[PDB]
Amino acid sequence: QKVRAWGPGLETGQVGKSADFVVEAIGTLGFSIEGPSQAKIECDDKGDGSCDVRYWPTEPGEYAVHVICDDEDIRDSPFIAHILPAPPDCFPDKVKAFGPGLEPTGCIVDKPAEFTIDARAAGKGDLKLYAQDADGCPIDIKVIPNGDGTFRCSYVPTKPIKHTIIISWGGVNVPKSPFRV
Amino acid sequence: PTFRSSLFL
Numbered sequence: 488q489k490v491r492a493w494g495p496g497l498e499t500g501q502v503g504k505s506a507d508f509v510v511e512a513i514g515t516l517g518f519s520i521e522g523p524s525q526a527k528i529e530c531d532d533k534g535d536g537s538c539d540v541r542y543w544p545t546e547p548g549e550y551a552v553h554v555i556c557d558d559e560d561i562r563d564s565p566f567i568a569h570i571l572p573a574p575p576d577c578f579p580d581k582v583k584a585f586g587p588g589l590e591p592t593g594c595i596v597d598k599p600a601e602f603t604i605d606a607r608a609a610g611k612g613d614l615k616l617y618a619q620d621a622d623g624c625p626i627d628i629k630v631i632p633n634g635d636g637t638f639r640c641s642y643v644p645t646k647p648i649k650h651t652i653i654i655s656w657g658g659v660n661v662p663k664s665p666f667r668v
Numbered sequence: 669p670t671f672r673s674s675l676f677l
Contacts, residue, residue, distance in 0.1 A: 515677055516676065518674060518675050519672060519674030520673045524671060524672075525671045526671070526673045527673065530677065542673075550670065606675070
């Protein structure tokens with residue numbers, strides 16, 4: 488079918504913090520969420536046949552994320568996501584990330600696009616990326632931790648085209664993310 | 669309690 492969907496919120500998340508992911512085209516679309524809490528859901532259309540989807544669990548526990556193309560589930564859907572309770576000491580909203588390799592584009596043929604990640608005002612947590620292009624090919628991003636809570640990371644496009652980078656701290660998608668290039 | 673929420677377009 489015409490529908491791809493990936494990202495942090497199909498695996499994990501934290502309570503009362505939006506579990507997020509991406510859905511791409513390749514009829515009319517739909518989602519539903521069986522879980523221990525009333526989840527609230529929204530697909531923010533980016534314009535480009537892809538849309539930011541976020542739901543809001545209010546209970547620790549496991550939730551089943553059905554994405555549905557027509558009449559019936561996406562390929563791997565339902566996805567099954569274990570939502571963790573918000574640690575007292577984790578601030579994803581307070582993570583910042585930036586640089587040439589997160590723009591519009593300018594990102595050229597085969598060539599490195601830089602970018603950093605400042606997690607210092609962000610408490611304790613596991614960092615995890617999610618990157619696929621405009622065809623659901625995975626994107627490799629070596630991430631080199633400097634030590635001080637900041638991170639050198641880069642990748643190499645091949646295309647005058649769009650690559651999508653999702654960023655999770657403590658399994659929670661980060662502000663300004665998912666970045667589209 | 670089990671709950672189911674859902675959206676379509």
